[PDB]
Amino acid sequence: MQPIILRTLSARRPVQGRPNLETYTSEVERWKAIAQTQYALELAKEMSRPALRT
């Protein structure tokens, strides 16, 4: 058995840990706020109706 066969090649990924996601989390919170506004607008439209006219 004399062919050179390579068994354990190192991977592409680096050894470091996961970079933090604070800026991504902030932008996601911005999207959440935008999405909450579009439902809050409808419910607010509901809030401004007259009192006893059912």
């Binding site: 109706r49 007259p50 006219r53 059912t54």
Partner: protein, 162 residues
């Protein structure tokens, strides 16, 4: 009381207008969810006793002093009143889930309930915890989408009593 359809009718009637595209969209949404609501209501009515048993077991395990002497649910009469209250909460939450509207909880449940509980010495936070226990059990039994639907009315009851 109102359902989603009656809520739309009330809006458009007080405005004096015929149904527009947005109204038809709202009505389509309620019709689309109708099958899920009917399925969940049937499941709950099939399982109401078990839901009460599990929810009261969890409430009285978390707060064992309720059903011991000195606790508001210590006597056969006050334990019975307790589980009957939980049963009514479950039934009216099921009603409000079918209607797609929380109005029936305002008309038939919440108004004057905080005062009655304070006047009788019923612990209100413990009652809210029992309602939450029913929420957990019911969500387990109905499935994910129906759980997200029933949670709205359970939380409505919880916030009304809180």
């Amino acid at each position: 009381m109102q359902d989603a359809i009656t809520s739309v009718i009330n809006t458009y009637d007080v405005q004096g207008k015929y149904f527009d595209t947005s109204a038809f969209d709202k009505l389509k949404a309620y019709y689309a969810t109708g099958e899920l609501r009917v399925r969940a209501a049937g499941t709950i009515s099939a399982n109401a006793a078990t839901i009460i048993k599990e929810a009261s077991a969890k409430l009285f395990s978390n707060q064992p002093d309720l059903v011991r002497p000195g606790g508001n649910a210590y006597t056969t009469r006050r334990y019975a009143a307790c589980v009957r209250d939980m049963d009514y909460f479950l039934r009216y939450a099921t009603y409000a889930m079918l209607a797609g509207d929380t109005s029936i909880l305002d008309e038939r449940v919440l108004n004057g309930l905080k005062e009655t509980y304070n006047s009788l010495g019923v612990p209100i936070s413990s009652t809210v915890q029992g309602i939450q226990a029913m929420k957990e059990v019911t969500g387990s039994l109905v499935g994910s989408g129906a759980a997200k639907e029933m949670g709205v009315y359970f939380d409505y009851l919880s916030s009304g009593l809180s």
